Point group: D2
Chain length 58, copies 4
Protein backbone atom coordinates (compact mmCIF):
# COMPACT_ATOMS: atom_id res chain seq x y z
CA UNK A 1 0.00 0.00 0.00
CA UNK A 2 3.18 2.27 0.31
CA UNK A 3 3.72 5.20 -2.08
CA UNK A 4 7.51 4.89 -2.01
CA UNK A 5 9.98 2.16 -1.47
CA UNK A 6 13.52 2.09 -0.12
CA UNK A 7 15.99 3.81 -2.41
CA UNK A 8 13.42 5.94 -4.32
CA UNK A 9 14.77 9.38 -5.03
CA UNK A 10 12.34 11.99 -3.66
CA UNK A 11 12.18 15.66 -2.92
CA UNK A 12 10.08 17.95 -0.77
CA UNK A 13 7.35 19.55 -2.93
CA UNK A 14 7.34 22.95 -1.29
CA UNK A 15 8.67 25.16 1.57
CA UNK A 16 12.04 24.01 2.98
CA UNK A 17 13.90 21.92 0.40
CA UNK A 18 15.15 18.33 0.90
CA UNK A 19 16.12 15.76 -1.75
CA UNK A 20 17.69 12.27 -1.55
CA UNK A 21 16.78 8.62 -1.04
CA UNK A 22 14.06 6.98 0.99
CA UNK A 23 15.86 5.20 3.85
CA UNK A 24 12.95 4.44 6.20
CA UNK A 25 9.29 4.74 7.22
CA UNK A 26 7.21 5.84 10.20
CA UNK A 27 3.54 5.86 11.25
CA UNK A 28 1.74 8.09 13.72
CA UNK A 29 -1.87 9.35 14.01
CA UNK A 30 -0.82 12.77 12.65
CA UNK A 31 1.31 11.18 9.93
CA UNK A 32 0.00 7.70 9.20
CA UNK A 33 2.36 7.30 6.20
CA UNK A 34 5.69 9.02 6.73
CA UNK A 35 9.19 8.53 5.27
CA UNK A 36 12.81 9.03 6.31
CA UNK A 37 14.85 10.60 3.50
CA UNK A 38 18.70 10.76 3.54
CA UNK A 39 19.99 13.89 1.77
CA UNK A 40 21.94 13.24 -1.39
CA UNK A 41 23.82 16.51 -0.73
CA UNK A 42 24.67 15.93 2.98
CA UNK A 43 25.42 12.15 3.43
CA UNK A 44 24.32 10.79 6.79
CA UNK A 45 21.74 13.53 7.54
CA UNK A 46 18.18 12.21 7.45
CA UNK A 47 14.89 14.17 7.78
CA UNK A 48 11.35 12.69 8.13
CA UNK A 49 8.23 13.93 6.28
CA UNK A 50 4.60 12.92 5.64
CA UNK A 51 4.04 11.27 2.24
CA UNK A 52 2.00 14.35 1.10
CA UNK A 53 5.09 16.53 1.45
CA UNK A 54 7.18 14.43 -0.89
CA UNK A 55 7.30 13.58 -4.57
CA UNK A 56 9.41 10.99 -6.41
CA UNK A 57 11.82 12.22 -9.13
CA UNK A 58 14.10 10.19 -11.44
Amino acid sequence: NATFGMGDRVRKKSGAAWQGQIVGWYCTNLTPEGYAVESEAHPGSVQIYPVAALERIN
Copy 2:
Protein backbone atom coordinates in the same frame (compact mmCIF):
# COMPACT_ATOMS: atom_id res chain seq x y z
CA ASN B 1 17.33 -9.06 13.71
CA ALA B 2 15.76 -5.73 15.05
CA THR B 3 16.39 -4.60 18.65
CA PHE B 4 12.99 -2.93 18.99
CA GLY B 5 9.61 -3.37 17.50
CA MET B 6 6.73 -0.99 16.84
CA GLY B 7 5.12 0.27 20.02
CA ASP B 8 8.10 -0.45 22.35
CA ARG B 9 8.52 2.30 24.89
CA VAL B 10 12.09 3.64 24.69
CA ARG B 11 14.14 6.54 25.91
CA LYS B 12 17.38 8.21 24.94
CA LYS B 13 20.20 6.91 27.18
CA SER B 14 22.11 10.14 27.51
CA GLY B 15 22.48 13.81 26.40
CA ALA B 16 19.23 15.37 25.11
CA ALA B 17 16.22 13.49 26.51
CA TRP B 18 13.46 11.82 24.45
CA GLN B 19 10.98 9.13 25.54
CA GLY B 20 7.94 7.54 23.83
CA GLN B 21 7.01 4.76 21.41
CA ILE B 22 8.83 3.30 18.46
CA VAL B 23 6.83 4.37 15.38
CA GLY B 24 9.30 3.60 12.58
CA TRP B 25 12.73 2.53 11.33
CA TYR B 26 15.50 3.80 9.06
CA CYS B 27 18.81 2.54 7.63
CA THR B 28 21.82 4.49 6.41
CA ASN B 29 25.58 3.75 6.28
CA LEU B 30 26.15 6.00 9.32
CA THR B 31 23.15 4.54 11.13
CA PRO B 32 22.46 1.06 9.80
CA GLU B 33 19.79 0.41 12.49
CA GLY B 34 17.86 3.54 13.40
CA TYR B 35 14.40 4.17 14.90
CA ALA B 36 11.69 6.83 14.79
CA VAL B 37 10.29 7.52 18.28
CA GLU B 38 7.08 9.54 18.88
CA SER B 39 7.25 11.50 22.17
CA GLU B 40 4.79 10.39 24.80
CA ALA B 41 4.88 13.97 26.18
CA HIS B 42 4.41 15.85 22.86
CA PRO B 43 1.97 13.78 20.66
CA GLY B 44 2.74 13.97 16.96
CA SER B 45 6.41 15.03 17.34
CA VAL B 46 8.81 12.31 16.22
CA GLN B 47 12.64 12.24 16.46
CA ILE B 48 15.00 9.63 14.89
CA TYR B 49 18.02 8.03 16.64
CA PRO B 50 20.55 5.21 16.14
CA VAL B 51 19.73 2.05 18.11
CA ALA B 52 22.82 2.64 20.34
CA ALA B 53 21.30 5.88 21.60
CA LEU B 54 18.13 4.23 22.83
CA GLU B 55 17.07 1.83 25.55
CA ARG B 56 13.71 0.09 26.10
CA ILE B 57 11.85 0.77 29.38
CA ASN B 58 8.56 -0.72 30.65
Copy 3:
Protein backbone atom coordinates in the same frame (compact mmCIF):
# COMPACT_ATOMS: atom_id res chain seq x y z
CA ASN C 1 10.57 43.88 17.13
CA ALA C 2 10.65 40.19 18.45
CA THR C 3 7.43 38.43 19.50
CA PHE C 4 9.14 36.34 22.18
CA GLY C 5 12.13 36.69 24.36
CA MET C 6 14.49 34.18 25.96
CA GLY C 7 12.82 32.12 28.65
CA ASP C 8 9.20 32.69 27.47
CA ARG C 9 7.14 29.54 27.83
CA VAL C 10 5.58 28.68 24.46
CA ARG C 11 3.79 25.86 22.76
CA LYS C 12 3.09 24.80 19.20
CA LYS C 13 -0.44 25.93 18.23
CA SER C 14 -1.37 22.93 16.12
CA GLY C 15 -0.21 19.64 14.51
CA ALA C 16 2.78 18.01 16.27
CA ALA C 17 2.98 19.21 19.89
CA TRP C 18 5.98 20.94 21.51
CA GLN C 19 6.08 23.05 24.69
CA GLY C 20 8.95 24.60 26.71
CA GLN C 21 11.16 27.69 26.85
CA ILE C 22 12.50 29.92 24.13
CA VAL C 23 16.27 29.28 24.05
CA GLY C 24 17.23 30.88 20.73
CA TRP C 25 16.33 32.57 17.43
CA TYR C 26 16.92 32.12 13.70
CA CYS C 27 16.22 34.02 10.46
CA THR C 28 15.87 32.71 6.93
CA ASN C 29 13.90 33.89 3.85
CA LEU C 30 11.30 31.15 4.44
CA THR C 31 11.21 31.85 8.17
CA PRO C 32 12.30 35.42 8.79
CA GLU C 33 11.37 35.20 12.52
CA GLY C 34 11.99 31.75 13.96
CA TYR C 35 12.64 30.44 17.49
CA ALA C 36 14.47 27.56 19.17
CA VAL C 37 12.36 26.02 21.95
CA GLU C 38 13.79 23.56 24.54
CA SER C 39 11.16 21.01 25.65
CA GLU C 40 10.12 21.26 29.27
CA ALA C 41 9.33 17.51 29.14
CA HIS C 42 12.58 16.31 27.49
CA PRO C 43 15.48 18.50 28.86
CA GLY C 44 18.21 19.15 26.31
CA SER C 45 16.07 18.47 23.21
CA VAL C 46 15.42 21.62 21.19
CA GLN C 47 13.18 22.08 18.10
CA ILE C 48 12.95 25.20 15.86
CA TYR C 49 9.70 26.74 14.53
CA PRO C 50 8.46 29.88 12.74
CA VAL C 51 6.87 32.45 15.06
CA ALA C 52 3.43 31.77 13.46
CA ALA C 53 3.55 28.20 14.71
CA LEU C 54 4.00 29.18 18.33
CA GLU C 55 2.01 30.84 21.07
CA ARG C 56 3.13 32.03 24.53
CA ILE C 57 1.43 30.49 27.60
CA ASN C 58 1.94 31.30 31.31
Copy 4:
Protein backbone atom coordinates in the same frame (compact mmCIF):
# COMPACT_ATOMS: atom_id res chain seq x y z
CA ASN D 1 32.31 35.89 22.95
CA ALA D 2 30.63 33.99 19.98
CA THR D 3 32.68 31.69 17.72
CA PHE D 4 30.58 32.41 14.63
CA GLY D 5 28.50 35.24 13.39
CA MET D 6 25.48 35.43 11.11
CA GLY D 7 26.29 34.51 7.53
CA ASP D 8 29.51 32.54 8.30
CA ARG D 9 29.78 29.49 6.10
CA VAL D 10 30.21 26.40 8.29
CA ARG D 11 30.10 22.66 8.05
CA LYS D 12 29.67 19.75 10.43
CA LYS D 13 33.11 18.33 11.31
CA SER D 14 32.13 14.69 11.44
CA GLY D 15 29.28 12.10 11.32
CA ALA D 16 26.17 13.32 9.43
CA ALA D 17 27.11 16.09 6.99
CA TRP D 18 25.62 19.62 6.93
CA GLN D 19 27.04 22.77 5.31
CA GLY D 20 25.64 26.31 4.81
CA GLN D 21 25.27 29.65 6.58
CA ILE D 22 24.82 30.51 10.21
CA VAL D 23 21.26 31.87 10.51
CA GLY D 24 20.74 31.79 14.28
CA TRP D 25 21.86 30.87 17.80
CA TYR D 26 20.59 28.95 20.83
CA CYS D 27 21.65 28.30 24.44
CA THR D 28 20.79 25.42 26.73
CA ASN D 29 22.61 23.72 29.65
CA LEU D 30 23.58 20.80 27.38
CA THR D 31 24.55 23.15 24.56
CA PRO D 32 25.46 26.52 26.00
CA GLU D 33 26.69 27.80 22.59
CA GLY D 34 24.67 26.39 19.71
CA TYR D 35 23.99 27.58 16.14
CA ALA D 36 21.25 27.29 13.52
CA VAL D 37 22.71 26.57 10.06
CA GLU D 38 20.65 26.85 6.82
CA SER D 39 21.81 24.31 4.21
CA GLU D 40 23.36 25.82 1.11
CA ALA D 41 22.18 22.71 -0.80
CA HIS D 42 18.55 22.62 0.47
CA PRO D 43 17.34 26.29 0.84
CA GLY D 44 14.95 26.80 3.73
CA SER D 45 16.00 23.69 5.71
CA VAL D 46 17.81 24.57 8.93
CA GLN D 47 19.50 22.23 11.45
CA ILE D 48 20.92 23.20 14.91
CA TYR D 49 24.27 22.01 16.34
CA PRO D 50 26.61 22.71 19.28
CA VAL D 51 29.58 24.94 18.38
CA ALA D 52 31.97 21.95 18.89
CA ALA D 53 30.29 20.11 16.03
CA LEU D 54 30.91 22.87 13.53
CA GLU D 55 33.84 24.45 11.75
CA ARG D 56 33.97 27.60 9.58
CA ILE D 57 35.11 27.23 5.94
CA ASN D 58 35.61 29.94 3.27
